[PDB]
Structure 1
Amino acid sequence: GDIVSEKKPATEVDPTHFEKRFLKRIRDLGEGHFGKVELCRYDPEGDNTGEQVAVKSLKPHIADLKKEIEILRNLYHENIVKYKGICTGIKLIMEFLPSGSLKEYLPKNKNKINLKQQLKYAVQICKGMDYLGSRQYVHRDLAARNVLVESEHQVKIGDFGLTKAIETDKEYYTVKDDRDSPVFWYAPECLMQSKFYIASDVWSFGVTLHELLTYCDSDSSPMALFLKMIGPTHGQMTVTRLVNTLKEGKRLPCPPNCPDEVYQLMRKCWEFQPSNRTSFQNLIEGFEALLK
């Protein structure tokens, strides 16, 4: 008799599924060598009223992006950027923070952001990082460019492209791809043996705190300052030159107008040996003591 077809199941909406046809690119926000993030509007009504979102996609590594999505999808913390969903190849949809990262926000808001507010941001970054460490992750890319500004009073860790799980009962993750490491943010064990501990993120945090205290000025950046300390024309010998400097005991200097008590907390992040470094919880205590 009549053509047979399939009875249609009632289709619910998944609020975490973003349809490609409604996701409209506004502009680039940032990138790496394999990934990039764009500002889009998700505009199903087509009248430019939809919400703005940050969209992370691959540059023309799918497995790594899917792993990043699964990591972020399951992080819930006020100082970690919010997962919104996916668009499926696959794109990661996150909340968009108009102020951008500390690199964008700090140079423009020096007058508004005093030492007290910097310390509160420092606490917030530590709380986010301590949460990540409690989920048994190492971030491996903690720098001011990856700290987003939600408001004058709040920051969030805003990218997880290099984040890796540390195996249960084990203490570090060993890295293989290292061609694009942010070496001027990396602890010695990372630079020398390619091992990543939670203590390695504490080291990076120290450097990120330096950036925050210098309002992310490009002439005071950890790279600029290190290249001054070791020489800017060593090419492929740069990292060995860096490693030796750190071995000698040389560190980034105290930022202008940074009180010594703040600088001492920073130096505890940079004990040459991972086991000798401060923890994120102890940093929080330290900053809070300075705020009260």
Structure 2
Amino acid sequence: VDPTHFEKRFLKRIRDLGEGHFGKVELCRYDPEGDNTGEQVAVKSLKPHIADLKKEIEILRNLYHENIVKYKGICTGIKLIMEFLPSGSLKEYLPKNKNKINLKQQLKYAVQICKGMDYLGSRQYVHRDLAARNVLVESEHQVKIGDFGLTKAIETDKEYYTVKDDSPVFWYAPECLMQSKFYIASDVWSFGVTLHELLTYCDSDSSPMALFLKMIGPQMTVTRLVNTLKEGKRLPCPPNCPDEVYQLMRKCWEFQPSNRTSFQNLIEGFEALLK
């Protein structure tokens, strides 16, 4: 018996967790005993792209880190089976838990995101989609990177991956916008934007999209965004965020990828502030 092979007849749908343009994640119970005692699992599938999901499954199958969502297996068309985290993403959890999550916890979550991300980089992958919606809450003390839908391997001895083919433009570094080039330093830029979200408790009115649209004016959006970044304009300091924290966030946003901070330097910076 292969423990990573989930039989369709025992995989019982409970409800939707979230839906995208091409796929969805559902809460299922794998119940071979048929008495509702089986384990709850998160199941990613496509709407009735297939080749991309198979590449995603093989990426996650080989990633093992305390801050990366656990691969469980497959249901073969194919479905990706993962551990279920009931608290959902930071985007859903943070607005409902402000009283529980203070600055010290936001900085520990920031460290955890950086550790998962530094690990993905050491395995030669560029995430391309780091945003709060992709960071899952295990507990009030732990987060995990929860999706790898856009993840690409960077060729040995190369610095970036060029993407051929709906992009999260308000989280994208200037090289991603202008040349479709994705470096490890591009994920650091996206991390800076995710840190801004975490510090605002994912407030929709001060989302990266809302804030950049106010700067540029509410097919032409991306050109105005690139121009705004070339002028040196950046997302403002979050309310109640100390300047020393905002300075670390600003180091994620150096125009040139080679001038940006590393995830290791960010971890060191946050750990210095936590003392």
Q: Quick check: TM above 0.5?
A: yes
Residue 86 of structure 1 and its aligned partner are, at CA, apart by: 0.2
Normalization by structure 2: what TM-score? 0.99
- 2:81 is the counterpart of 1:72: no
Mapped to 2, the partners of 1:44 and 1:218 lie a distance apart of: 41
Deviation at 1:32, TM superposition (A): 2.2
Query: What whole-Å deviation, never above 9, does each CA across 1:200-252 have from its counterpart, x for those lacking one?
Result: 000000000000000001111100111111111xxx10000100000000000
Give CA deviations for 1:50-89 in whole Å, capped at 9, x if unaligned.
1111000111121111110000000000000000000011
Aligned equivalents of 1:115, 1:245: Cα separation in 2: 30
- C-alpha deviations, 1:11-59, integer Å up to 9, x for none? xx11101000111111111122222111111111111111111000111
- Which structure 1 residue ranges, 4+ long, deviate > 4 Å from structure 2? none
Residue 259 of structure 1 is matched in structure 2 by 242
**Distance across 2 between alignment mates of 1:193 and 1:35:** 27
* Structure 2 residue aligned with 1:46: 34
**Mean Cα displacement is larger for which, 35-44 or 260-269?**
35-44
CA–CA distance in structure 2, aligned partners of residues 249 and 291 of structure 1: 30
TM-score by length of 1: 0.93
Shift in Å at residue 109 of structure 1?
0.5
- Give distance in 2, aligned partners of 1:168 and 1:191: 23
| C-alpha distance in structure 2 between counterparts of 1:207 and 1:31, whole Å | 22
Matches within 5 A, 1:266-277: 266-277=249-260
Q: Quote the Cα distance in structure 2 between the aligned partners of 1:207 and 1:27.
A: 30
SS in 2 for 1:41: strand
RMSD: 0.7
Residue deviations 1:120-178 (CA, integer Å, cap 9, x gap): 00000000000000000000000000000001100000000000000000000001116
Alignment partners' CA distance in 1, 2:39 and 2:25? 16
Q: How many residues align?
A: 275
Q: How far apart, in 2, do the equivalents of 1:30 and 1:142 lie?
A: 17
Match of 1:3 in 2: none
- Following the alignment from structure 1 to structure 2, what is the Cα–Cα distance between the partners of residues 84 and 108? 29
Q: Which piece of structure 1 moves more, 28-37 or 210-219? A: 28-37
The 3-state SS of whatever aligns with 1:269 is: helix
**Residue range with higher mean Cα deviation, 182-191 or 32-41:** 32-41
Task: Specify the alignment match of 1:247 in structure 2.
Answer: 230
Gaps of 5+ in 2: none
Alpha-carbon separation, structure 2, partners of 1:226 and 1:15: 46
Query: Where does structure 1 lack aligned partners over 5 or more consecutive residues?
Result: 1-12
Specify the alignment match of 2:195 in structure 1: 209
